[PDB]
Structures are given as structure tokens and as C-alpha cells.
Design a protein around this nucleic acid. Structure first.
Ligand SMILES: [Mg+2]
Lengths: 180, 50, 87, 59, 141
RNA sequence: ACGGGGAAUCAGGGUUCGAUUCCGGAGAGGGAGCCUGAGAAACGGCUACCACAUCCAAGGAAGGCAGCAGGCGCGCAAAUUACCCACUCCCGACCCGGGGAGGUAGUGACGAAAAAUAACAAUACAGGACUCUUUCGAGGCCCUGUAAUUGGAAUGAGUCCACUUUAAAUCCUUUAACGAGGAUCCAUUGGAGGGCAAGUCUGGUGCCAGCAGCCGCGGUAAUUCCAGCUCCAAUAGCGUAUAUUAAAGUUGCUGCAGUUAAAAAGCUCGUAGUUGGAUCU
């Protein structure tokens, strides 16, 4: 007997066919376009979308005025609107099945800091975030997979203690300044 | 049979050393190279000879 | 078992006590008293967990042994005393 | 930003009464005994073999 | 055809019970004779002592000599033949050595040219054959 | 074969697992019998017998780790003879004492989550698209790479003041100082005939050695062995053996078959079982 918790999950599922040529080209295109590290980072978002589509398909088989359909349908739709994947004027349970992986991949902090002009590429954004140069609402974040909530889009800035903001220069400029 | 020819060709093969070469990229930069190679800048194969 | 039990595990405690999983292995077993074990609120879970007058179970004892708490007009110094409905 | 907890007592006497004895030693107001669980336990088991006042004269 | 009544559950269940025993996988798993005849006794690996070096000639149309070893199992005293996998890996084994032995890929069936051999060597004297073959470790002295 | 709560797999139905921290049961080497007590047929209580085993001056005396560490043995198969009652609780005559319950560190690629191994600019091309010049060409508009071409900018991983944490510590978090150019602060594991993504490249061997889950390769020009180079799959992980689920509509209730591929009893009677025609406001 211990005061410990053993609850955990796996966040991805592997594909059934390991060497499907059409799927290998489709997934590398996403990796290259959004600057991902490995195929496991595509199967994670794809798993999350697969679980969202499965809840919607189960709610869509209930009565249109089923009390559980109107409670957990509104919650799912509101959750999808909040992060910016679904539109404000499309809060219908049939528009969830029209969602794509690219919608979910566009809300990553890595994509957003690049699309806001902080970084010169999608690979510069990765290192900028991992090197503690970016903050969201006074909090320093160094997780590139941080999903940006809609009313956080305006509060992504350079960190207050970084050479790219008002901070001191890094070790290299300091060392070369004393070189002469 | 007669257990006297074990290791024959492995011991017969001449020994050739590996050429030293520039190290390989790893992680997010290795998979960027493949994307650039296959999609942005391009009936045969990657290892087609002649 | 060869006799009565004296312990209570935290997951086996009444759910309306609202006890978290990772504070400990054990929960206060209510003393025998006017109210049942599964239909009572012990004094420790009321002084510490609800009112937050105490931070640990040792502080509940220090409040109780000063004779500050009266349950229906009588001072109880037992920290697992089974208070209950309408008390 | 750092978050912590704080307590302010009416008097040093009330602080000494109610404070944990490990949080008083940090202020220099309590000295622990410099022994070990093993030391005390082994000493305890040796006195079981001795009966009477001769328990005191046991090391 | 098959009975289709509402009070047929006993008939259906008893017929399925009886007819499952004609499935050879089911019978092999659930009868118990294939567990007593298994030298490993249900284990994936086993340790043993080398008695002799043997050479097994391959089945036609192949013509070669697969290099195996005769091994006596420590836990029950049974005797098996184990194939030494790679090129020249028989030169690492010596008689009276203790070896780790595993199945050979087909759950008690022979594999390939090699006739009647169900096992393969994994380790010799607590050193894996892969490390010896690739020159990572040497035999203890 | 301890039983449930439950776990894996899964279109729907289903199949398999559950010694294991929660609930109930049972036991303390094997049987049996008791004393005390509210409660025990108690074993960190006693009395015998059976099996082991300890000290001895040989008269005698003392035993029970399926408690926490630890050792032997058995094996394919599993961690420290560590610190503490500070937390959660329990016991007592008790606000004070005790607790290998419990907590904290150590070992720990069982398994699960996040996430480094580089980024940018200027050059000149194999160059590429894109605009104009029919064409030569201009390209400062946008792109990829041998870049053994230049260039400073940024950062941990480490070393290490201090604070913080804590019963006392360690770790994480926070912070001074030092800390990155290219054989380095160097990513691995399996493969390249098909299934199944990726070389009839070059050298060696010559039905030998060996590969190969299956088909198959190897007999002097081997797409398959042994190596070099190159290539591709996942990636701080990836091979192998074994049990098991799906695939298996190859156990078929949903949902299979029985003329010739496996298969309808030689034929009829007959009890249990299964099934049973209209018809009532
Ligand atoms: Mg192919």
C-alpha cells in the first residue's frame, strides 16, 4: 500500500501497415511543412483528432433533444472554438467531421511565433521557443507543442530577459566584446 | 557432416577499413533534409545506379 | 479477522468526505458513537479539511485538547468523533 | 515569482507552544537529541533481558 | 441447418464446446500432452550444458552442413539440438560450456533446410553470440 | 483454479487475462489440542507428535522471515543488512511515549508523459522555378544543396557560489562565474529479389562458407552470403524468443460448410429436448 497513482495513457497509435508508400509521402509533407521532429509527432495529433471524431459520431446517434447530446455537444463545440480550430459561426455537430489535421497543427506555438514574424522560418521558431526566448502572457514557455488558445494570440512576445528583448546579451557577445 | 570449414569465407574476406566521413544530422534537421530533397527541389529510385 | 477492525483506507472512506488520493494511505476511522461510520463527518475532517483552522492532524489535536469545540453542548476532545446529521 | 506560506503569532510563548518543533529549530529555539533509531532500539531490546533496577545499568 | 429457437442456448453452447476440440490449435493448447512433451516446459528460453558438436546436413534441394550443438537442459535433464546461427560462431563454443537456448521462430516447428531442429543458441558463458561475432566482448578467462 | 471490483484486444458480436497495493476468504514448516480474554482453536502465545535444525562440560536448554532489509537454493526470470516518525493514520494510563504500518532517499530502458543533437546572414555555383527581352541576357523576386566557402549571434548538457526544498538532505525550479565549429559536446537498431520502403553498384567466395519466418539465394559475370560505398524504416530507442488478441466469415448467435475439394447415420420406429395452423373490441 502506497500513496501513489498509476493512471497514465499512451498518446498515439502506430499505423497498421508500416511501409505504405502513399502514407509515407503524406506524413513527411506535414513534418516538413510544420517543422516537426519525428513521425510520432504526427500520430499524436492524428490520435487526438481520431478521438474527437469518435465522440461526435457517438453523439450523432442520439436523439436531437437528448439531454446528454445537448450538454456534451455544446462542451465539445465550445472547446473546439476556444482553441481556434473550429469557426464561431459553425457550431454544429456535423461540422466536426469536416475538421483536418492541418487545422490542429496550425495552432502550435511553433507555427504561431513564425506566422507572427518573430522567427524567420519554421525551424528558427523551434529553436527560439526551446531556447527560452518566447513568453505568452508574462509566462515563459519552451514547449513547441503548446496549443495556443484563441484569446492568447495577442500575448505572444519575446521574453523580458532575453537578448532579443530588453535583456542582457548572451555569453558570446559579452566574451567577444572583451576580446578587442 | 565434418565441422572443419566453419568461418571460411568470413576469415577469407580481405579487410577494408571504413572511410571517415562528415557526421550525419540527427532529429528535426535530418528529416528536414529528406523533405527538401524529395518535395521542394526535384520513374527512378533514390539509390538508382547509372 | 479475529476481531474488530481499527483502520480505514483512503479509497474506502465515504466519498462525500472529499478526500484526495495522494495525501496518504489511511483515512480517519470514526470512533464508535451516535452516528454510523458511513453517514458521519469526523471532527478532524471538519476542523482541518473544511474550515482550514488547522493544517495538519497534529494541530487538530491542539485545538481539541484546549476544550474549544462543543458538539451539542458538550466538549469532545476526540478528534475522530462521529458528528452527524442535525448536530 | 515565488509562492509560500506564512504565520504570525501573538507572542513568542504561543509560538513555542503551537509551532512544530522542527520549525523552531530553524530559528535556533530547539535542540534535537543526537542519537539514532538503531541506537535507541538496540538499547531498548537489551533492557528486556534485565529485570529490576539493574535495567538502568545497561549499555 | 442449425436450430434457431429461443430455448436453444444449451444446445448451441454444448455443440460449440464439443466442436472446438476438432480445432488442432485449441486441442494442442488445452489438452496438456503438448505441454508435457515440450522440453522447455512452457518457457521462452532455457539454460543447458553442451555435450557434443554436431553437423546436420541440409534438406534437398539445398546442399550444405548446418552447424549445431547437442545440449542437455539443466532444469529437467532433457537433450536437444541447437543451431549456432552466424558465420563461424561454432568456433566460440566449447564442450561442457553453459549456453542459453531459445526457440527458433515457429513455435515448436522446424525452420528451413535444417531438419528436426527447433532451438538456437543465444549466449555462451553469459556472453551473447552477437557481441562475440561483432567483436564487442570476448570469452572470459 | 483464491473469488470479485477490474486489464488487453475490438466495426457490431466476441476471445483471453485477473498471484498483484481496494472488498471478502485462507494460512503462518505439516497435522492436532488448548490457556487467557469481549473477541483467537492466536503461532513476533503455550502443549504434544511428524520433518528439519541450534548450544552443551553429554546432565540438559532453546526453535519457526508466506513482516523490513539481507543470505542460500531454484531458476529465462525480480532492488539497500540505508534515514525518519516531519506527513497519513493506529495504539496506550496518554496534548508529551511507540510504530521496517507508513513516509524519504538508493538500485531501476517494466511501463507511461514532455523534449536536445543545431539556427541565421553574405557569397559562388549543380542549379531550380518565376518576370521581361522571339533569341543572346538582365534578374534584388522566391527556393534547394558539395558548400573540406566566410561570419559573428543564440543556447543548454556539463563544472559550480548561493538561495530555495526537507525531519535532515538529494532532485526539480531560481540565480552569479566558466562552458560550442566540424574527425565535435560524433545516435542507434535493423535492412536494400518479392511480400515490404530502399542498388542486376564495386571487391571476395564458388551447392563450400553461409543467408533464408515463406517463396527461395549460393555449382567462376551471386539484385539475396562476407565487406566497402550508397540508399530507407523508426528513432533515445530498435531487434529476438515465448504466451495471448485482432487478422479468423479458418469455431460461424450475428456468420461457415456436408453431389464431385474434409463431411448426411443402411433404414424406420420411439422417450427426454427443440418447435408448433385460423380464431375472441
Ligand atoms: Mg520495393
Amino acid at each position: 500500500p502506497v500513496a501513489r497513482s498509476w493512471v497514465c495513457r499512451k498518446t498515439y497509435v502506430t499505423p497498421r501497415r508500416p511501409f505504405e508508400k502513399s502514407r509515407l509521402d503524406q506524413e513527411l509533407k506535414l513534418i516538413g511543412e510544420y517543422g516537426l521532429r519525428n513521425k510520432r509527432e504526427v500520430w499524436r495529433v492524428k490520435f487526438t483528432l481520431a478521438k474527437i471524431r469518435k465522440a461526435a459520431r457517438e453523439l450523432l446517434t442520439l436523439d436531437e433533444k437528448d439531454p446528454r447530446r445537448l450538454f456534451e455537444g455544446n462542451a465539445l463545440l465550445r472547446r473546439l472554438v476556444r482553441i481556434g480550430v473550429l469557426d464561431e459561426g459553425k457550431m454544429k455537430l456535423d461540422y466536426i467531421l469536416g475538421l483536418k489535421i492541418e487545422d490542429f497543427l496550425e495552432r502550435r506555438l511553433q507555427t504561431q511565433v513564425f506566422k507572427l514574424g518573430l522567427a524567420k522560418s519554421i525551424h528558427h521558431a523551434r529553436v527560439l521557443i526551446r531556447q527560452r526566448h518566447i513568453r505568452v502572457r508574462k509566462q515563459v514557455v519552451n514547449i513547441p507543442s503548446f496549443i495556443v488558445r484563441l484569446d492568447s494570440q495577442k500575448h505572444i512576445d519575446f521574453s523580458l530577459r532575453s537578448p532579443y528583448g530588453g535583456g542582457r546579451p548572451g555569453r558570446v557577445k559579452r566574451k567577444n566584446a572583451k576580446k578587442g | 557432416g565434418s565441422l572443419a570449414r566453419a568461418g571460411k569465407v568470413r576469415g577469407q574476406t580481405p579487410k577494408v577499413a571504413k572511410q571517415e566521413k562528415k557526421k550525419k544530422k540527427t532529429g528535426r534537421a535530418k528529416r528536414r533534409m529528406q523533405y527538401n530533397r524529395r518535395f521542394v527541389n526535384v520513374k527512378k529510385g533514390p539509390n538508382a545506379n547509372s | 479477522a479475529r476481531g474488530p477492525k481499527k483502520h480505514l483506507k483512503r479509497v474506502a472512506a465515504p466519498k462525500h468526505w472529499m478526500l484526495d488520493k495522494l495525501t496518504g494511505v489511511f483515512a480517519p476511522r470514526p470512533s464508535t458513537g451516535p452516528h454510523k461510520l458511513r453517514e458521519c463527518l469526523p471532527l478532524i475532517i471538519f476542523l482541518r479539511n473544511r474550515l482550514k483552522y488547522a493544517l495538519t492532524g497534529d494541530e487538530v489535536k491542539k485545538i481539541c485538547m484546549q476544550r474549544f469545540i462543543k458538539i451539542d453542548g458538550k466538549v469532545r476532545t476526540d478528534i475522530t468523533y462521529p458528528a452527524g446529521f442535525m448536530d | 515569482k515565488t509562492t509560500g506560506f506564512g504565520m504570525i503569532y501573538d507572542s513568542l510563548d504561543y509560538a513555542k507552544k503551537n509551532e512544530p518543533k522542527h520549525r523552531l529549530a530553524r530559528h535556533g529555539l530547539y535542540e534535537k537529541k543526537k542519537t539514532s533509531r538503531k541506537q535507541r532500539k538496540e538499547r531498548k531490546n537489551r533492557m528486556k533481558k534485565v529485570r529490576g533496577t539493574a535495567k538502568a545499568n545497561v549499555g | 441447418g442449425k436450430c434457431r429457437g429461443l430455448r436453444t442456448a444449451r444446445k448451441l453452447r454444448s455443440h460449440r464446446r464439443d466442436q472446438k476440440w476438432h480445432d488442432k490449435q485449441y486441442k494442442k493448447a488445452h489438452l496438456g500432452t503438448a505441454l508435457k512433451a515440450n522440453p522447455f516446459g512452457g518457457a521462452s528460453h532455457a539454460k543447458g550444458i553442451v555435450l557434443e558438436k554436431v553437423g546436420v546436413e541440409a534438406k534437398q534441394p539445398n546442399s550444405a552442413i548446418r552447424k549445431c550443438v547437442r545440449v542437455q537442459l539443466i532444469k529437467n535433464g532433457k537433450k536437444i539440438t541447437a543451431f549456432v546461427p552466424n558465420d563461424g560462431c561454432l568456433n566460440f563454443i566449447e564442450e561442457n560450456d553453459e549456453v542459453l537456448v531459445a526457440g527458433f521462430g515457429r513455435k515448436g516447428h522446424a525452420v528451413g533446410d535444417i531438419p528436426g531442429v527447433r532451438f538456437k543458441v543465444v549466449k555462451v558463458a553469459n556472453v551473447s553470440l552477437l557481441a562475440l561475432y561483432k567483436g564487442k566482448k570476448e570469452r572470459p578467462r
